């Protein structure tokens, strides 16, 4: 149904045995996402802390 595919498809062993792949254009890994806390420091309210 297709001839060539340009898409972010993960190169795995189970997919190599049916279709071929070229050299990878973008390497990546598993990341960590946090809430990115800012320096929300108030003024007069922090004096009586």
């Amino acid at each position: 149904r297709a001839d060539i595919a340009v898409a972010p498809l993960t190169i795995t062993l189970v997919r190599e045995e049916v279709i071929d792949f070229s050299k990878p254009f973008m390497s990546l890994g598993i990341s960590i996402m946090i809430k990115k806390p800012q320096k929300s420091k108030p003024g007069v309210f922090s004096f009586l802390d």
């Binding site: 795995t12 960590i32 946090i34 802390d49």
Partner: protein, 49 residues
């Protein structure tokens, strides 16, 4: 004076999370992945303790 010194001592304490061992070292901040995919299959088929 001692209490403000203690609060500023808390202010320069432990840096935020920068590694997976930092995630394993704590239990207060929970975390999750996607319910289906090879990302969860990485942790499911993992060998590192």
């Amino acid at each position: 004076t001692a209490n403000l010194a203690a609060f500023l001592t808390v202010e320069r304490m432990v840096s935020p999370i920068e590694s997976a061992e930092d995630l394993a070292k704590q239990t207060e901040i929970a975390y999750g992945t996607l319910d289906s995919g090879s990302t969860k299959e990485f942790f499911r088929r993992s060998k590192i303790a």
